[PDB]
Design a protein around this nucleic acid. Structure first.
Ligand SMILES: C[C@H]1COc2c(N3CC[C@@H](C4(N)CC4)C3)c(F)cc3cc(C(=O)O)c(=O)n1c23
Ligand SMILES: C[C@H]1COc2c(N3CC[C@@H](C4(N)CC4)C3)c(F)cc3cc(C(=O)O)c(=O)n1c23
Ligand SMILES: [Mg+2]
Ligand SMILES: [Mg+2]
Lengths: 706, 631
DNA sequence: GATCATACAACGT
DNA sequence: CGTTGTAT
DNA sequence: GATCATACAACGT
DNA sequence: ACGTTGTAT
């Protein structure tokens, strides 16, 4: 046990359930050991709603809580409750709420008596800590608390504001005054009313009910349209789990239709390009990579992010990897056999350019980061539909995503043929887009028509099957389905023999080596053994044939999650691509203009170098003089003053005139594409085919259409 | 069994077990091994020294116990029939302390498995380094194959104790791994201080590999440098925090990002090992003069190791650090490339005060240790100045100013005056403190000491001798001198040797500034010549083919001056921008003579050092906290 | 530096 | 016997 | 994102 | 009921 307390005043004693261990150690160093205890909650706790009393006591985290609380699971007896006020403090994440949401599930589904009397309490942690000299101010919301603290800035000096993104970042004494010391402590008393007792149980049910996931989908669809001291648990539970359910659906687990990436994925790819680790740069240690991702853009777990960067670098997890690394990046038999970040070096892959090349052409928005010191892109200018090329498989609260990867050349031609005939129907797209293209050579056996349903309804499943020959009578598997381990498939096919379920099999051998990636041999006892029939069993028994559910749920351009079909995904991406190039063009035009405007100002100086130099020496501020005596603009005048004497030579005049001829022609070409909607398309129809030419490859997974 | 990845075969004549050093290195060694006849077993961290451990104690260590179970033979058991593998090969990282992991493995294969190494079953794998240094855990799995696993291109040796070198293999290994025979290893270092063989001698490899580690730790891990008073793990952190812009005025940065840069750039060692060091610098109650400031939970006096993860804590350099880095940009110290050879790191740091005695250090090398207590700032400063003004000052005269140590606590030092006179005259000894708590003394540890006394003015006297109220502190003034070798020095020797370093780093600072001023003045001439004749310069630039030689011939300016002129901007032609140029000329002319006068006159040199050691102690002057009187 | 138990949707055995 | 701070 | 165990010197119990 | 799948504490 980690909780200690001296006094035994059932009305004064007080328990605090901190979220983190790092936070627990700080909360214990500053707590009042006289009548206050503290016990950390390593990681997230069990969802004790639909768990049996025997199971609640079988989970470490909930167990210790049940012992420290004093009461037994589902025991309406509080005669030996060690502490009076059982407080639950967690950090102000969307995550901590979830931690606070399921602690209520524990203190409700089992310890109903504890909350009925009103002993469950939630602490209000501070958001910001603004200070100026002998003045300390804490905030809970930047709209009301932080706004006033900064508004009353009529005192000398520049205030300092520390953004506490989590209680782990707080100092012991700095945490004592905010949530521990009752004087300066903010804390609300969670209570379940007697009249609202029927609703407090109904709300928490659909929120934490494993089976009522469909109800939550309709719940979030309704609460999203109209989204705008003692607290009632009825109110708390619904508001806390909503701020989480949305947070996960948006900023953790579901990707964006445009760039086909997740925020942890995006912030990782950008932070590598920003660190200079493009496809050509020499590899950099994965540590600094993840140090920058978390240190600047993604305030979450170190190990959790590097796990995402591993999958982006594995040629067998992604179809078109985004990262190339040096070191032990795992093996097909187990993707998680990978080395630490401190040992593995990484960089961006050639395919990553399709997401980053157009980043400097004002083709994307930009939102501040969590601390506000830097600037990160809200999305990335994808030049091909990455959402379909690599796919994703996520799990949000109320919904999930399962998008299989597809071939690059097959999607590109589908994008080209959809702008040449905007009336293209789905059946016409399937004549080119043939189906999922996994990073394996296993045949997709799902029927062609069954695929049409999957790409019209946005849901369904496809099944893969391994490839094999009968060299020398023995069967030899040559390639396995996606995400199927050879060691696992062999162990399954081996444990059967021990269970006497395959008395016709002689031996099983794994001949995988450098030349042959995955060679699995299966020898029968007699040549007269119907290995053709033996296999039809192993497909329906082992992982030699694995199904794959498809759920094309994604954040659409409209900022909302939705299940698109193949046509809606491509049609809606071309809206995204046609709009970024539109922005990519106007951006260059905006700079060509401003250049030609500088240049024409320079030529005026050359044609009047005598007067200019005379005005510079015979005037206090030359810029106003140069504008009245020549008609030039202030922006043009500044450039004149910045001309170096080197530039007054004749050659540099010829260079300036050289640009203005080149740029003048460039200016007209841009104005033409932007103005002509047909020229605009001809550009897209060209850039897409060009990208496929330099990044497309042959189809890995055949569809078994002979 | 254990985590050892066994092979499919069982032939005692063709099986082999590889004991890798790193677990991540073992994960890659398991992908690339031939699953038929090759088997690996990881060895997390360093193993226990079983040279002194008993037969039953050998089986207690979980690492050594698994090695025994995997090997087959039991500790000190004569029966060799139980041998699950034929070749017992060890694969350690080319790290110096990787050769230490190998030596410790030999201590068991000889003291407890003598018949195993005698029969010629202990083998050594020679790891190549070339691709960068490419550590074992860092290289590619397939790359690790062709270097240590694939027998075709594998480089391994056969360790065997010769019958003639048997008595020597035992006597040599003894003093190397004898916890008590530490003084013998000190004398061994003094007397002892690409070609390879296909079968080396265990006795010859035991004394060779343990000497590398014995020297690597004494130099690059444990002992500090006399000048900056820092170890490499400490020096690299300071530099990397400045190169990242974490100055005194900058905002705090997450320590995780800071440590990450220290490792990937300069310091190829443990991550928690680096963060633990940086906290020893940031805690105000471990260093008297901290080098790091931070936000969050940086420990508490009751338990320094109760601190928050590097991911939650954020830190920056402190004001006191400026004494080590202010003069780093004036070419004052030497520079050596980093370990991978892509960046450069400083060899020394331009210390403006003798940090070796201000903060002190506490290290444990091989054969020798280090115990330097911290000292007062205004005292070590007032001593250095008085040593310059009177080079013939004696330690007794020095003790009149430097009263003794200065610990970060108000507890009084009860050591006698004559006892301290022996500390600073011999370079060794101890010192004692008494509560009013002492340095490094926990408030919870002493209470439990007095509480156990309860279960089973004069009262305080008995509590000082029983509880931790009265503690002792060892003192050993060992350090790497400017001569690049370890040596124990005293106060009158340490201060004198430091002022040789300070009088050299400042001399380099002066000549570095002198070299820059003369270069600027040379430019300012060609510029003033242009303002005096700008009318011609413009005509020469617009009416001549190539102005660079033309401006040189006419005006007698040099190649560099004519280039500066061409780089003038039209706004630099107004009257002001010439007054601004005549301002430097008259300003830098004053400095060009002061420096030359301060560098050519050894008397003006000392006046600067004396004036600089005094002005620097002003802003950085904190009166001491620990009283000092006999008791 | 490598173990570890959780949430979450929802399809397969 | 346990102390200290860098190391695997 | 906390936790385990080792080295190594030499003084204090 | 079990086992995934992949970003989170
Ligand atoms: C929240 C902390 C600590 O708990 C974690 C895990 N456990 C295993 C034991 C279990 C427990 N409640 C009994 C102690 C929680 C775990 F398996 C993985 C992580 C990964 C990360 C990270 O990626 O940063 C991380 O921070 N934590 C983790
Ligand atoms: C060398 C590696 C792995 O082994 C380590 C430890 N153990 C756990 C018990 C002990 C053993 N003989 C039973 C296996 C070794 C340990 F306790 C700490 C670290 C810390 C760091 C680091 O700071 O990086 C580190 O790298 N390692 C560590
Ligand atoms: Mg948080
Ligand atoms: Mg190494």
């Amino acid at each position: 046990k980690l909780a200690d307390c001296t006094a035994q005043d059932l009305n004064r004693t007080e328990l605090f359930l901190v979220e983190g261990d790092s936070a627990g150690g700080s909360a214990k160093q500053a707590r009042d050991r006289e009548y206050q205890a503290i016990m950390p909650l390593k990681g997230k706790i069990l969802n004790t709603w639909e768990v049996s009393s025997d199971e609640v006591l079988a989970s470490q985290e909930v167990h210790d809580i049940s012992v420290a609380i004093g009461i037994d699971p589902d025991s309406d007896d509080l005669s030996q409750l060690r502490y009076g006020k059982i407080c639950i403090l967690a950090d102000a994440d969307s995550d901590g709420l979830h931690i606070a949401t399921l602690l209520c599930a524990l203190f409700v589904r089992h310890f109903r008596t504890l909350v009925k009397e009103g002993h469950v309490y939630v602490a209000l942690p501070p958001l910001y800590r603004i200070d100026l000299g002998k003045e300390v101010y804490y905030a809970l919301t930047e709209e009301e608390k932080t706004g006033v603290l900064e508004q009353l800035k009529r005192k000398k000096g520049k205030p300092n504001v520390q953004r506490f993104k989590g209680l782990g970042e707080m100092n012991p004494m700095q945490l004592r005054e905010t949530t521990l010391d009752p004087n300066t402590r903010r804390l609300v008393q969670l209570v379940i009313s007697d009249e609202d007792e029927q609703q407090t149980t109904a709300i928490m049910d659909m929120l934490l009910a494993k089976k009522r996931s469909e109800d939550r989908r309709n719940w979030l669809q309704e609460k999203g349209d109209m989204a705008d001291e003692r607290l009632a648990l009825h109110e708390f539970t619904e508001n806390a789990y909503l701020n989480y359910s949305m947070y996960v659906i948006m900023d953790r687990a579901l990707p964006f239709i445009g760039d086909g990436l997740k925020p942890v994925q995006r912030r990782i790819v950008y932070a590598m390009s920003e660190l200079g680790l493009n496809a050509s740069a020499k590899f950099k240690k994965s540590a600094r990579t993840v140090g920058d991702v978390l240190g600047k853009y993604h305030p979450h777990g170190d190990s959790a992010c590097y796990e995402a960067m591993v999958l982006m670098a594995q040629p067998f997890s992604y179809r078109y990897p985004l990262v190339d690394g040096q070191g032990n990046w795992g093996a097909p038999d187990d993707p998680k056999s990978f080395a630490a970040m401190r040992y593995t070096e990484s960089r961006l892959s050639k395919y990553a350019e399709l997401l980053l090349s157009e980043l400097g052409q004002g083709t994307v928005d930009w939102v501040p980061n969590f601390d506000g010191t830097l600037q990160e892109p809200k999305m990335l200018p994808a030049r091909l539909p990455n959402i379909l090329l690599n796919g994703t498989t996520g799990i949000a609260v109320g919904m999930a995503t399962d998008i299989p990867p597809h071939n690059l050349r097959e999607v590109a031609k589908a994008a080209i043929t959809l702008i040449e005939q905007p009336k293209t129907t789905l059946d016409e797209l399937l004549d080119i887009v043939q189906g999922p293209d996994f990073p394996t050579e296993a045949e997709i056996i799902t029927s062609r028509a069954e695929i049409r349903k999957i790409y019209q309804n946005g849901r369904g499943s496809v099944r893969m099957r391994a490839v094999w020959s009968k060299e020398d009578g023995a069967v030899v598997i040559t390639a396995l389905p996606h995400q199927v381990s050879g060691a696992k498939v062999l162990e399954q096919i081996a444990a059967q023999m021990r269970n006497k379920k395959l008395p016709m099999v002689d031996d099983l051998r794994d001949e995988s080596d450098h030349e042959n990636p995955t060679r699995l041999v299966i020898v029968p006892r007699s040549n007269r053994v119907d290995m053709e029939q033996v296999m039809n069993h192993l497909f329906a028994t082992t992982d030699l044939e694995k199904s794959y559910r498809i759920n094309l749920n994604m954040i659409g351009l409209d900022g909302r999650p939705a299940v698109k079909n193949l046509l809606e995904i491509l049609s809606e991406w071309l809206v995204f691509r046609r709009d970024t190039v539109r922005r990519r063009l106007n951006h260059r035009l905006e700079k060509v203009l401003k250049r030609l405007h500088i240049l024409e100002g320079l030529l005026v100086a050359f044609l009047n170098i005598d007067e200019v130099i005379e005005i510079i020496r015979t005037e206090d501020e030359p810029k106003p003089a140069l504008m009245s005596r020549f008609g030039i603009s202030e922006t043009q005048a500044e450039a004149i003053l910045e001309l170096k004497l080197r530039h007054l030579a004749k050659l540099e005049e010829m260079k300036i005139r050289g640009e203005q001829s080149e740029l003048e022609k460039e200016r007209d070409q841009l104005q033409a594409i932007l103005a002509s909607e047909r020229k605009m398309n001809n550009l897209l129809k060209k850039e897409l085919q060009a990208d496929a030419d330099a990044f497309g490859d042959d189809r890995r997974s055949p569809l078994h259409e002979r």
